[PDB]
């Protein structure tokens, strides 16, 4: 069938959804291809190219909220941001272990240099709005991969596996979501007094 | 060599070190261990067996303040506990990665147990202790996979990941960390009214 890089992808997320990420090869992408291996290595070079095409297209098809709307309050776009970030990573099978290490690619560099101008445009050092934005991200990834991962007890440890349980991480997430920003907040308001 | 649990375990973190999670097997470590493949199987019966003995084998060796001191404010132990947690997972290579798709052992309930219940004696409700303690996990996890992988930029971004690779996630991981207990305090604090 049609191997433009769009085609190619699709197959290989359709991929990662059967076989997950350990189980993902190049030779079984030839496979659904309807291809010899020889022919898909001149559009992949191997598994390590076929994860860092995932990784990014992970993002640009399915994380929307990259942006602040239009006077929306810093804390509302890391909200927004999170749950964005979070879904993208749960949309496929291992979309987390797909996602760790790499970092963005060219093509969404203005939109994480936007997300970093916009945070010191609302009271941030670049710093504390980086590690506010990089908290949240460790944070959001951490919570998906113990999530998609997942996939005798004392009584304290029963219950809190059955809360665990319960959902798909969510309500854990949200919940701790919120934490996060307003404690970046008491951070953020204190500016040089002792907080 | 000697093929008690201690010893299987030994040279399986240190073969760990040598190769990664990907490329560690049971036939290396047979090879590093002076036996056959077979032998090794009697003692561990495969790759999945001897991953989850070693994530069980990182906390207990290496994770030391999984428990609060006499006295301990609950904000101090989250602190220590997240800073013992993270250490331990940066001690042995891809150790986040062999952290990951475990729950706590047997061995190890009772401590998860009085982790939770230290929480309720402290305002906590058990939820909420649990949304706390999974999200400073969370939050933990997702900061040394982040960091143990990644081992024409624009303006704001190229000095973002200078201050990000000037360091090992120390400084970013430790901001963000205070961030989230004093928003948990926030939360904790207000009981009832809006918050
Ligand atoms: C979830 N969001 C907060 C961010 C985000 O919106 C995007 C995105 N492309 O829209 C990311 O790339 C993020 O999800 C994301 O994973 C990156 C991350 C960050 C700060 O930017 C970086 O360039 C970068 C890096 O190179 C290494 C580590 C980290 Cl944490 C980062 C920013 C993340
Ligand atoms: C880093 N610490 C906050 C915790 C901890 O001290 C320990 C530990 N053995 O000492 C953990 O097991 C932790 O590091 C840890 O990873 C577990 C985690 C928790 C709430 O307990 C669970 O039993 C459990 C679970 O089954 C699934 C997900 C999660 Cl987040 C959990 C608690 C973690
Ligand atoms: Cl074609
Ligand atoms: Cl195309
Ligand atoms: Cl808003
Ligand atoms: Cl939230
Ligand atoms: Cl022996
Ligand atoms: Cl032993
Ligand atoms: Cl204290
Ligand atoms: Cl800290």
Do not use: C
């Not at 030839?30 to 022919?39: D, F, N, S, V, Y």
């Not at 070079?45 to 076929?50: C, D, E, G, M």
């Not at 990834?141 to 596996?161: C, D, F, I, S």
């Amino acid at each position: 069938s049609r191997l433009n890089r769009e085609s190619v992808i699709d197959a290989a997320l359709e991929l990662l959804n059967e076989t997950g990420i350990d189980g993902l090869t190049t030779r079984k992408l030839a496979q659904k291809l309807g291809i010899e291996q020889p022919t898909l290595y001149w559009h992949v070079k191997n598994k390590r190219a076929l994860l860092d095409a995932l990784a990014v297209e992970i993002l640009a098809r399915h994380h929307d909220y990259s942006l602040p709307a239009a006077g929306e309050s810093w804390q509302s776009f890391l909200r927004n941001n999170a749950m964005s970030f979070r879904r993208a990573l749960l949309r496929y099978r291992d979309g987390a272990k797909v996602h760790l290490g790499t970092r963005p690619d060219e093509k969404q560099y203005d939109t994480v240099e936007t997300q970093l101008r916009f945070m010191t445009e609302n009271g941030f050092s670049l710093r504390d709005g980086l590690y506010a934005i990089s908290a949240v991200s460790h944070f959001t990834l951490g919570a998906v991969l113990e999530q998609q991962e997942h996939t005798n007890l004392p009584p304290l440890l029963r219950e809190a596996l059955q809360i665990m349980d319960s959902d798909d991480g969510e309500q854990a997430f949200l919940h701790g979501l919120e934490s996060l920003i307003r404690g970046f907040e008491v951070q953020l308001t204190a500016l040089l007094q002792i907080v």
